[PDB]
Amino acid sequence: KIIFVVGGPGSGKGTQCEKVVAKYGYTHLSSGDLLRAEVSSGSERGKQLQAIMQKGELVPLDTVLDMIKDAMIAKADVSKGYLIDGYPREVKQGEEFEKKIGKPCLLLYVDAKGETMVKRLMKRGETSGRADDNEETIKKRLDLYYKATEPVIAFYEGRGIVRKVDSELPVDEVFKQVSTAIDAL
Numbered sequence: 001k002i003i004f005v006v007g008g009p010g011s012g013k014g015t016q017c018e019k020v021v022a023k024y025g026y027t028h029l030s031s032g033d034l035l036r037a038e039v040s041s042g043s044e045r046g047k048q049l050q051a052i053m054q055k056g057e058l059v060p061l062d063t064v065l066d067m068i069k070d071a072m073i074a075k076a077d078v079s080k081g082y083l084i085d086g087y088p089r090e091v092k093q094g095e096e097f098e099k100k101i102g103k104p105c106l107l108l109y110v111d112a113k114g115e116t117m118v119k120r121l122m123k124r125g126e127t128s129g130r131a132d133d134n135e136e137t138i139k140k141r142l143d144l145y146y147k148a149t150e151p152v153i154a155f156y157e158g159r160g161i162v163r164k165v166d167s168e169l170p171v172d173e174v175f176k177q178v179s180t181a182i183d184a185l
C-alpha cells in the first residue's frame with residue numbers, strides 16, 4: 001500500500017503523517033527528511049542539495065526518487081504500507097515513481113490556504129530556525145508549489161485516487177478526515 005501525501009509548504013503534511021504512523025502503523029517517508037539527512041552527512045552531494053533547498057527550488061528527480069526508493073527498500077520487510085510525504089512534486093515524479101516502484105492507491109491532498117502556509121512557516125522559522133523558513137524562501141516555495149505541484153493533483157484526479165483534507169481545521173479535526181479516507185480503503 002503506497003499513499004502519496006501532497007500539499008503546500010507548511011500545509012501540515014508531516015503532522016498528519018505522524019498521526020497516521022501512531023494509529024495505523026504505516027511507514028512515513030519524507031523526501032525533505034531524506035534530503036536533509038544527506039546534507040547532514042557532510043557529503044559533497046549534501047552541499048549541492050543544501051544550496052538548492054535554501055533557495056526553495058526542486059532537487060532533481062533522479063536524486064530524490066533514488067532516496068525514496070532506498071528508504072522503501074530498507075523498510076520493505078516491516079512495512080504494511082507507506083506514506084510518501086512530499087513526493088511527487090511534479091507530474092514526471094509521479095510517472096517515474098510508477099515506472100520504478102509501483103502505483104499509489106491513494107493520494108491525500110492536504111489543502112491549506114496560501115496565507116495560512118506563510119504564517120505557519122514564518123512561525124516555525126522563528127521557533128526552530130530551519131534555514132528555508134525565511135520569508136523570501138517561503139514565498140518561492142509557495143510559488144513553486146502553485147506552479148509545479150498542483151498539476152500532480154490533477155493527474156491523480158484523472159486516476160481517481162485523490163481525497164482532499166481541509167488542513168485549515170485544527171490538527172485533530174484534519175486527522176478525522178485523514179482517518180476517514182484511510183478507513184475507506
Ligand SMILES: Nc1ncnc2c1ncn2[C@@H]1O[C@H](COP(=O)(O)OP(=O)(O)OP(=O)(O)OP(=O)(O)OP(=O)(O)OC[C@H]2O[C@@H](n3cnc4c(N)ncnc43)[C@H](O)[C@@H]2O)[C@@H](O)[C@H]1O
Pocket residue numbers: 007008009010011012013014015016031032033035052053054056057058059060064085086087088089093120121124132141167168169170171174
Ligand atoms: N519531491 C521533491 N522534489 C524535489 N525537491 C524536493 C522534494 N521534496 C523535498 N524537496 C526539497 O526539499 C525542500 C523541503 O521539502 P519538505 O521538507 O518537503 O518541506 P515542505 O514541503 O516545504 O513542507 P514542510 O515539511 O515545511 O511542511 P509540512 O506540510 O509537512 O507541514 P508540518 O506538518 O511540518 O506543519 C507546518 C507547521 O504548521 C503546524 N501545523 C500543521 N498542521 C496544522 C494545523 N492543522 N493547524 C495549526 N497548525 C498546524 C505544524 O505544527 C508546523 O509548525 C523543498 O522545498 C525542496 O527544495
